[PDB]
């Protein structure tokens, strides 16, 4: 087979399981998985790579802006998709773009570049030993998406694990990328937009919150409450029903974590409104490492509350 897309396109139009092996190498290619039960197994998680260069500010061949949702390298929008031993990355050079002068005509304002977008139909998304490379907005999940990440790696700095859907991480490595642009804060690990009606969002079980060699201490927030600007019946404003949930359990944290931080959104009159972590579903449970603290601003789960985040409870109808 020529490409990952050629293999997916050739697969029968039924809902039968389809396995695509990937021998080591770099596949500069974009994906939109519409077929269910598609499993992508690569030769090595580091050696096998799917990666395109797409920034939100960039223009499609049309050509209007791609946008955050359009910037995905691999866009999953089907149930039972699984990825095994491969890297999905966005080739966008965030640091170099920030290195560009303000006078530089090629510098972009919209700097988010999604590696993996798990859309509303991406149910039972399974991820055994997978690296996700990015800088801003690396992993994006939407309401309806239910995914399980085991023995996996995710890198980025600004809101690199963000969105609505249920996304669980078991014994995974969450890397905070270094930045030469700014003084701290450098970025924020999660930006959950978990809907008020949906009980689960971004969960981290037995995982590691690591930092890159250059990253200073107290430069990263665990989370930041994302209230997406949504066009409603009466106007377009930060969706109030989007009170995100990011939970960390038995997770060791390097010294770069300073805690949680707040998000600026837009009013019904179109003005800067602040959503605070206190009002958001941000919780910790027996988290370890130098970047772990307890204070007025680190709300922690009770023994009874922790019982709800058992893997069978969070995924009842899924074997996992």
Give an overview of the whole structure.
- The PDB classes it as hydrolase.
- Keywords: right-handed beta-helix, carbohydrate esterase, hydrolase.
- It forms a monomeric assembly.
- This protein is mainly beta.
- The protein has a single domain, classed as Pectate Lyase C-like, CATH 2.160.20.10.
- 7% of the residues lie in helices and 38% in strands.
- The longest helix has 7 residues.
- It is globular.
Briefly say what this structure is.
By secondary structure, the protein is mainly beta.
Task: Give the CATH class.
Answer: Mainly Beta
Number of strands: 27
Q: Which percent range fits the helix content?
A: under 10%
Give the strand content. Answer: 35-45%
**Alpha-carbon distance between the two ends:** 30 Å
Tally the helices.
4
CATH topology: Pectate Lyase C-like
Task: Note the overall shape.
Answer: globular
* Largest sheet report: 15 strands, parallel
CATH superfamily: Single-stranded right-handed beta-helix, Pectin lyase-like
Question: What Rg do the Cα atoms give?
Answer: 19 Å
Domain count, please report it: 1
Structural class: mainly beta
Reported CATH architecture: 3 Solenoid
């Amino acid at each position: 087979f020529s490409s990952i897309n050629a293999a997916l396109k050739s697969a029968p139009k039924d809902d039968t399981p389809f396995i695509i092996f990937l021998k080591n190498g770099v596949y500069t290619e974009r994906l939109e998985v519409a077929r269910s039960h598609v499993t992508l197994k690569g030769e090595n998680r580091d050696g096998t790579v799917i990666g395109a260069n797409t920034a939100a500010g960039m223009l499609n061949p049309q050509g209007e802006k791609w946008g955050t949702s359009g910037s995905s390298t691999v866009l999953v929008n089907a149930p039972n998709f699984t990825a095994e031993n491969l890297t999905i990355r966005n080739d966008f050079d965030f640091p170099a773009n920030k290195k560009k002068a303000d006078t530089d005509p090629t510098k972009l304002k919209d700097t988010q570049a999604v590696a993996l977008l798990l859309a509303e139909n991406s149910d039972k998304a399974r991820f055994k030993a997978v690296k996700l490379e990015g800088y801003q907005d690396t992993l994006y999940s939407k309401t309806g998406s239910r995914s399980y990440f085991s023995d996996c790696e995710i890198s980025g700095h600004v809101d690199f694990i963000f969105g609505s859907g249920i996304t669980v991480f078991d014994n995974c490595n969450i890397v905070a990328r270094d930045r030469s642009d700014i003084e701290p804060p450098y970025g924020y690990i999660t930006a959950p937009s978990t809907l008020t009606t949906s009980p689960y969002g971004l969960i981290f079980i037995n995982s590691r919150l690591t930092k890159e060699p250059g990253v200073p201490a107290n430069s990263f927030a665990l989370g930041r409450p994302w209230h997406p600007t949504t066009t409603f019946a009466d106007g377009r404003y930060a969706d109030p029903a989007a009170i995100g949930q990011s939970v960390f359990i038995n997770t060791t944290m390097d010294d770069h974590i300073y805690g949680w931080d707040k998000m600026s959104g837009k009013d019904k009159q179109g003005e800067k409104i602040w959503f605070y972590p206190q009002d958001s579903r941000f919780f910790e449970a027996n988290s370890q490492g130098p970047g772990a603290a307890i204070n007025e601003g680190r709300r922690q789960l009770s023994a009874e509350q922790l019982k709800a985040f058992t893997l069978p409870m969070i995924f009842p109808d899924w074997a996992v």
